[PDB]
């Protein structure tokens, strides 16, 4: 009696959903019971992903506020895409990338009820704009911004520096990040000519510095492929910042997770989200739930979808305790001990059936 | 039945108390009045020492010990004579709160010393001090003797090895520095430091931004530390003005285990402030002496949650919040039939 169950759920109605396709309720394509189309609990879009919608030009408007927050998203950014940010680019870059911004998000979203978010804007004082330096056939990078040598620098060892401001959020989560490589300038350079790339955002209400340097010798070519996108996820509190650059291209954010309204800690919950067998998957959301802020819920079957329409079916009712072993629907007993419990959370202890008269015969003219 | 306690407790044998009091025994069996955990294994304690104390200052105590369920028993200084203590409650504050976070995930805690590579002549200089205690972490290293001023870039290697974490102080004077005896009253420092990890590019910077001397008209210059969570491997130190500080003593982290809260009991609020859901417990018990605490740590508890810790593992009257071990139920549950 009262197994945990393997289900994503809620002890409440205040919960909400991240999603992609299959819980875009705008019905063959969804994993989510359609009942819950009307709830106003999710926020979802076909083909996107928070990491997706974070780094790129293709942005979808995710936002939600919940004391349990679920996710079930992350495949639209996989290894199959094959993102790069250059010919000679390396995805497992960006599969690093993905399990950072995806911690720092679940870590964060045990703490706070409301995720969006915001653009940031800069102030800078040259006369050079952006540049989409990291793309491909597909996709276009956008966040952070990458800003052109100025028209008067003959090579790219100079400091460069613009003013940025986080307001309207309790915590915003940004990314820092350098090409992590021998960067080049140019092709008119010589071979033996590279760049180092460093770039820091600085605190100015606190003096706190935040720095990164490039350490890794790959290079965007076939004899030295490897060069990408490190990317770090910093949480940083509302204030005014100075991102300095200390040698090659500028970059600042342009857009943050905006984090709003403190809770009590509740972890959130996180489905598995990946293809078909054949297609080429990732467990960076795997590595990114851990306790005590996360729970991982997979299926048992491969995704062909019976198993994950029945994970998502707690949706539907409440239960009692969400705990690392599952749902318990009862707050009473069970015959197993709930490990990190939320909710009112039922005894393994030995409580027997009780009665006054013990039943042990029939009775041919009284019920049960 | 089975109200939560308002005390410190432990789920099996596995625990571990750091403390700043005297855990010693003092020696019809009956007449011997030592608590029975008297120079136990568990424990860890000095009176008059804190792992604070220990941390920054030159009155050291080896604290080291491990277990699943650590326990905190919780029994003013300023770096120059028109400094700020507030900072040192701030410092204070900072560093349990990393401690305290980081003893939830980890079984052993210790101190190392920290060693250092520095190309010049110059020498530590004990510059952070009062009448009664001068602290020795962060080391800060003289300017050298061909440098007029103090506006200088200065570095030094050191290296972090044997724990999977170090917690070290990241520490700038924050306000207006001043350099020597005969020179401009109108000319001063603005103290900046960072610590960068060689292997990984990794950089935490630390820039003084106040604008408070050290004089009876302006007063306020004092020590502002960061404690940070560093991985092993090779660091720099790196000065932009002001001389150079760097770790002498870290914090040494090892063995991690599940996720499982601290617990913290007193007797400033600085320990409660850093004592937060989810990594600690804070208990406000009354009697309250070490020697009590001793006594009630005993025996075991079967579940410790946010109210407190529940004898039984049964019923209860309160529902547990954030429970470890095995949770009593309050749900409305004579002789049992099956
Ligand atoms: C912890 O809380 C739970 C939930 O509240 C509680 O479990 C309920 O206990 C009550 C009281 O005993 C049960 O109600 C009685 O049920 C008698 C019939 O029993 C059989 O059928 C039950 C109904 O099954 C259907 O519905 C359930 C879900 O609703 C579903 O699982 C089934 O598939 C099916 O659709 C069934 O629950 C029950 O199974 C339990 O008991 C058996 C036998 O001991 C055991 O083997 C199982 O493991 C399981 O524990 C069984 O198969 C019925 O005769 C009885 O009616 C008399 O009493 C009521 C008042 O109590 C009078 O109104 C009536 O006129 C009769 O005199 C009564 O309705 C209820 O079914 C339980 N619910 C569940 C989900 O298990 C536990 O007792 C709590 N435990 C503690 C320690 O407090
Ligand atoms: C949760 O766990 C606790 C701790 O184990 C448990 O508390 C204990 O309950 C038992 C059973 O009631 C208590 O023992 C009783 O003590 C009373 C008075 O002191 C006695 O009179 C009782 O004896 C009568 O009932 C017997 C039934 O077999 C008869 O044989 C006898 O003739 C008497 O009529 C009985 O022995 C015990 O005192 C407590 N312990 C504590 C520390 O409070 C509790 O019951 C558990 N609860 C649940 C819901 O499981
Ligand atoms: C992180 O990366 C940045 C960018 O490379 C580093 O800053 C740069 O440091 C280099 C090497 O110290 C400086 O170049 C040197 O200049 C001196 C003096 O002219 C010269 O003698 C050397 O041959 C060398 O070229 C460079 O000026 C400096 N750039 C800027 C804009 O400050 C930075 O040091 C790295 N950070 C850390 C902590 O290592
Ligand atoms: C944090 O603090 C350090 C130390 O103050 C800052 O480094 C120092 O910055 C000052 C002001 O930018 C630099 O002084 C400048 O010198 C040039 C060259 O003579 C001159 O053009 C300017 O008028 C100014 O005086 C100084 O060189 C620099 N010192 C070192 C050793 O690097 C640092 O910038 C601060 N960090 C941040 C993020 O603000
Ligand atoms: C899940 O539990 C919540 C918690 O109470 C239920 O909230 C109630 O919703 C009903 C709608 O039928 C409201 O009329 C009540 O006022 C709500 N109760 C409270 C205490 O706010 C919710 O209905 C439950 N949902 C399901 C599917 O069982
Ligand atoms: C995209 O989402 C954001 C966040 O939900 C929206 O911005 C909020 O808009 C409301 C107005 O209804 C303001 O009161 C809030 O201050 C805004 N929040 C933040 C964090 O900026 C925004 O309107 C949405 N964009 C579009 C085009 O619908
Ligand atoms: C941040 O920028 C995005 C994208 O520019 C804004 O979303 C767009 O808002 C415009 C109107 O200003 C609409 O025409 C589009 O439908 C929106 N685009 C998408 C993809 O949803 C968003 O409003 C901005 N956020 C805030 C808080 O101002
Ligand atoms: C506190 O709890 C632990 C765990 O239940 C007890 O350790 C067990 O002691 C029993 C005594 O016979 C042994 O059977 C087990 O082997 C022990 N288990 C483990 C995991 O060590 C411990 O004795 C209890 N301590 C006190 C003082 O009651
Ligand atoms: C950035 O802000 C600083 C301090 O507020 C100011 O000195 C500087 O002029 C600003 N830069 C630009 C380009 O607006
Ligand atoms: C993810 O996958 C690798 C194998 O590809 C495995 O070794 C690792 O344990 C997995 N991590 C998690 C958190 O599932
Ligand atoms: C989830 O389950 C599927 C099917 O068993 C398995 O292949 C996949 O690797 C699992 N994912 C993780 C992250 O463990
Ligand atoms: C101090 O404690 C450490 C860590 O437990 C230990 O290795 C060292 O030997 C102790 N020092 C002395 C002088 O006993
Ligand atoms: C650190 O130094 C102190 C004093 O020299 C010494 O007692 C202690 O044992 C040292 N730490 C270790 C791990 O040996
Ligand atoms: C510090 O380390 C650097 C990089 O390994 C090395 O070149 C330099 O010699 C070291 N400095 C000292 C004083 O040992
Ligand atoms: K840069
Ligand atoms: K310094």
Do not use: E, I, M, Q
């Given at each position: 009696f009262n197994e945990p169950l393997n289900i994503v759920s809620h002890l409440n109605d205040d919960w909400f959903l991240f999603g992609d396709a299959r819980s875009?309720?705008?019905?063959?394509?969804?994993?989510?019971?359609?009942?819950?189309?009307?709830?106003?609990?999710i926020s979802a879009k076909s083909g996107n992903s928070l990491f997706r919608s974070f780094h790129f030009i293709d942005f979808y408007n995710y936002s939600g506020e919940g004391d349990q927050v679920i996710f079930y998203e992350?495949?639209?950014?996989s290894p199959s895409h094959?993102?790069?940010?250059?010919?000679?680019?390396?995805?497992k870059r960006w599969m690093g990338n993905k399990a950072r911004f995806y911690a720092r998000v679940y870590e964060k979203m045990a703490q706070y009820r409301s995720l969006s978010f915001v653009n940031v804007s800069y102030a800078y004082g040259g006369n050079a704009k952006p540049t989409s330096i990291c793309k491909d056939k597909t996709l276009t990078l956008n966040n952070p911004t990458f800003i052109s040598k100025e028209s008067?620098?003959?090579?790219?060892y100079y400091e460069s520096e613009a003013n940025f401001t986080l307001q309207g959020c309790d915590e915003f989560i940004v990314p820092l990040c350098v090409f992590n490589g021998?960067?080049?300038?140019?092709?008119?350079?010589?071979?033996n000519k590279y760049y180092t790339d460093s770039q820091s955002y600085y605190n100015m209400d606190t003096g706190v510095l935040y720095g990164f340097n490039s350490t890794l010798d790959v290079g965007?070519?076939?004899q030295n492929p490897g060069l990408d996108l490190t990317c770090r996820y910093l949480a940083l509190t509302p204030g005014n910042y100075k991102a300095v650059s200390l040698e090659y291209l500028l970059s600042l954010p342009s857009k943050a997770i905006c984090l709003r309204k403190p809770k009590s800690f509740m972890p959130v919950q996180v489905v598995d989200s990946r293809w078909n067998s054949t297609r080429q998957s990732d467990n960076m959301t795997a590595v990114a739930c851990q306790l005590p802020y996360c729970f991982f819920r997979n299926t048992s079957?491969?995704?062909?979808?019976?198993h994950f329409r029945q994970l998502l079916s707690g949706l539907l009712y409440n239960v009692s305790c969400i705990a690392q072993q599952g749902a318990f629907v009862y707050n009473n007993v069970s015959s197993s001990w709930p490990a990190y419990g939320y909710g009112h959370c039922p005894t393994a202890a030995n409580i027997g059936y009780m009665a006054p008269v013990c039943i042990y015969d029939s009775d041919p003219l009284v019920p049960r």
């Open positions: 875009d309720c705008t019905l063959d394509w969804l994993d989510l019971d359609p009942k819950l189309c009307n709830s106003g609990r992350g495949v639209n950014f094959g993102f790069k940010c250059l010919a000679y680019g390396d995805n008067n620098y003959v090579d790219y021998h960067s080049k300038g140019s092709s008119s350079d010589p071979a965007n070519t076939v079957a491969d995704y062909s979808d019976f």
